[PDB]
């Protein structure tokens, strides 16, 4: 079964033994984003397709609320998202709106971040 959460967009695919997440991201209200993030629940995996903020922007917020155990993505998507999340936090803090996550959430999101290439079959 698959739930389409989406403000934030996400694809939770409850298999029956895990809660695998596809593309937690926000292209553009922070409170309804936080409530919609709480609506997902504890996810085992957060798979990132690409390194755009329309599909990766909410990944550090998910490690603030401790709702993800592993963030798998492509090894170039990860390095991209380093710059992407620090730039998003630079803009968000710079705009003087209250930051949705912190740089520590960026760091800790890259602490549980695994990386695989194309055509590499993982079994989790």
């Amino acid at each position: 079964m698959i739930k389409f959460i989406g403000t934030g967009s996400a694809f939770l695919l409850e298999t029956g033994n895990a809660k695998i997440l596809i593309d937690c991201g926000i292209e553009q209200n922070n409170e309804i984003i936080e409530k919609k993030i709480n609506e997902i629940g504890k996810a085992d995996i957060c798979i990132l397709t690409h390194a755009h903020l329309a599909a990766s922007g909410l990944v550090p917020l998910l490690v603030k609320k401790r709702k993800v155990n592993k963030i798998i993505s492509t090894p170039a998507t990860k390095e991209l998202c380093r710059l992407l999340f620090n730039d998003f936090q630079r803009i968000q803090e710079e705009n003087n709106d209250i930051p949705l996550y912190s740089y520590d959430d960026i760091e800790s999101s890259f602490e549980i971040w695994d990386e695989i290439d194309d055509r590499n079959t993982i079994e989790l």
Partner: protein, 111 residues
């Protein structure tokens, strides 16, 4: 959506809200001659498990037989050349245990 329904393909738009596909595993081996050794009803079996679209089928040598009669970049060095080179570079300390560790780590991510 209209063009892909024109390709006779079911489409569920996100402004809206069903079959139960279930991949199964088939034994395809006869579990008659079967004993209990350590309170477990077991059988040592030799077989050729196959992963078909939608179905994993364990299959006896009869399977390989039938399929046998039906059927029948990166540089290059020999296996011994690779072992001899990594042996020399390990004892010359170019290749280390940390270098081999991170090469295995990046090789487990893909090629």
């Amino acid at each position: 959506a209209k063009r892909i329904i024109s390709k006779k393909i079911r489409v569920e738009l996100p402004e809206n809200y069903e079959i139960l596909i279930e991949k199964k595993v088939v034994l395809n081996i006869n579990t008659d001659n079967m004993c209990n050794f350590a309170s477990y009803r077991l059988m040592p079996f030799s077989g050729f498990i196959v992963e078909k679209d939608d179905r994993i089928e364990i299959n006896d040598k009869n399977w390989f037989d039938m399929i046998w009669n039906e059927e029948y970049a990166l540089p290059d060095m020999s296996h011994d050349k690779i072992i001899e080179n990594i042996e020399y570079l390990f004892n010359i300390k170019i290749l280390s245990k940390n270098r081999i560790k991170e090469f295995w780590e990046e090789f487990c991510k893909g090629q």
